[PDB]
């Protein structure tokens, strides 16, 4: 649903692999396209309007070149739906569209209105809403990537010893979009992947990450989330629930537990220092 070049820039995995927040990374990307033999004019055109001779054999070209470059995992097993003359979608396009409709940042009335639009879009009689949701998703992905670049270049990610710590700040690019737990958690996951692929320091490449973001400055509140260590074969089990609870109680923190996942909580801003000290000393 957009150009080949946009997909390569905005996919989390390739963006991390080629380091495309740095200008040298763009040169590496051009070397990749040159190996495939795709003209740059074709790559900048929309996928629907590309030359049919290239479209028919694209997946083999990309997998072969990716394998040579050391990207061993470019294919996935999935499903797709087709109806009418020209409506076709992969199973993931529906997910990003629905998710974007539901977690939309604009205060267009109460949050239930966003939920209502997300639910309605899952029926075939309401197809125009699906096409609207895709446009919201495109903006969401772009905002995520420029945020990650700003975070790394400004050097906000800091080691505290047993964990990596990072925090966003008001007015900087697109912070409103990351106020909710869903978008915030997914952003933080992409950030950790980018950091571990970037750094050479072995002691940095096996750590969990704790991220904090502004919730309400008029309430003096911040949202806090913790991620398990990043490895390919990890069981996805994480321990930050009981860690946050024990640290908060030992600190007597002013905090609230609200979301259904136990890894995300709300904190008063003034308590964050002693709460972090308690976490550092507890994880030891």
């Amino acid at each position: 649903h957009w150009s080949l070049h946009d997909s390569l820039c905005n996919t989390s995995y390739t963006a991390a692999r080629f380091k495309l927040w740095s200008v040298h990374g763009q040169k590496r990307l051009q070397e990749f396209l040159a190996d495939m033999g795709l003209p740059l004019k074709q790559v900048k055109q929309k996928f629907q309007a590309m030359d049919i001779s290239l479209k028919e054999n694209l997946r083999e070209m990309i997998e072969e070149s990716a394998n040579k470059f050391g990207m061993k995992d470019m294919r996935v097993q999935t499903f797709s739906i087709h109806f009418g003359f020209k409506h076709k979608f992969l199973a993931s396009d529906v997910v990003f569209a629905t998710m974007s409709l539901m977690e939309s940042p604009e205060k267009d009335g109460s949050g239930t209105d966003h939920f209502i639009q997300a639910l309605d879009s899952l029926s075939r009689s309401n197809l125009d809403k699906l096409y609207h949701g895709l446009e919201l998703a495109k903006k969401q992905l772009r905002a995520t990537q420029q945020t990650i670049a700003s975070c790394l270049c400004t050097n906000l990610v800091i080691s505290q010893g047993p964990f990596l710590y990072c925090s966003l700040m008001e007015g900087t690019p697109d912070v409103m979009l990351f106020s909710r737990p869903a978008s915030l958690s997914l952003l933080s996951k992409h950030l950790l992947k980018s950091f571990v692929c970037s750094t050479k320091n072995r002691r940095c490449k096996l750590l969990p990450l704790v991220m904090a973001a502004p919730l309400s400055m008029e309430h003096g509140t911040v949202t806090v989330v913790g991620i398990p260590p990043e490895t390919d074969s990890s069981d996805r089990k994480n321990f930050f629930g009981r860690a946050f609870e024990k640290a908060a109680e030992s600190t007597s923190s002013r905090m609230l537990h609200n979301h259904f996942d136990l890894s995300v909580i709300e904190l008063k801003a003034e308590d964050r220092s002693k709460f972090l000290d308690a976490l550092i000393s507890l994880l030891s």
């Binding site: 109460s110 939920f115 209502i116 309605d120 009689s125």
Partner: protein, 97 residues
């Protein structure tokens, strides 16, 4: 609604109330016991049940005997068509799908 009664004259209210009394008398006499409310079934019927979405915060709505539902905004219900029909016309509910 009171917002709309503000435009009528006093004698116009007299006329309107007389008309309601007489019309209600006619419907009650049509047949059987307590007649037929011909001000309903404005469109030809397709199904027994419909799904409705609430547009406004509204009070309690009685479905049968003591059973009732609360019309809070963006709550959604599945109900028989003949009970919802007037509330849809006045603009409280929306017929989805």
């Amino acid at each position: 609604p009171n917002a709309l009664r503000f435009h009528m004259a006093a004698e116009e209210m007299e006329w309107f109330n007389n008309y309601k009394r007489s019309l209600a008398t006619y419907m009650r006499s049509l047949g059987g016991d307590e007649g037929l409310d011909i001000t309903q079934d404005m469109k030809p019927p397709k199904s027994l049940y419909i799904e409705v979405r609430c547009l406004k915060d509204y009070g309690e709505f009685e479905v049968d005997d003591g059973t009732s539902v609360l019309l809070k905004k963006n709550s959604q219900h599945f109900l028989p068509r003949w009970k919802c029909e007037q509330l849809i016309r006045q603009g409280v509910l929306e017929h989805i799908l």
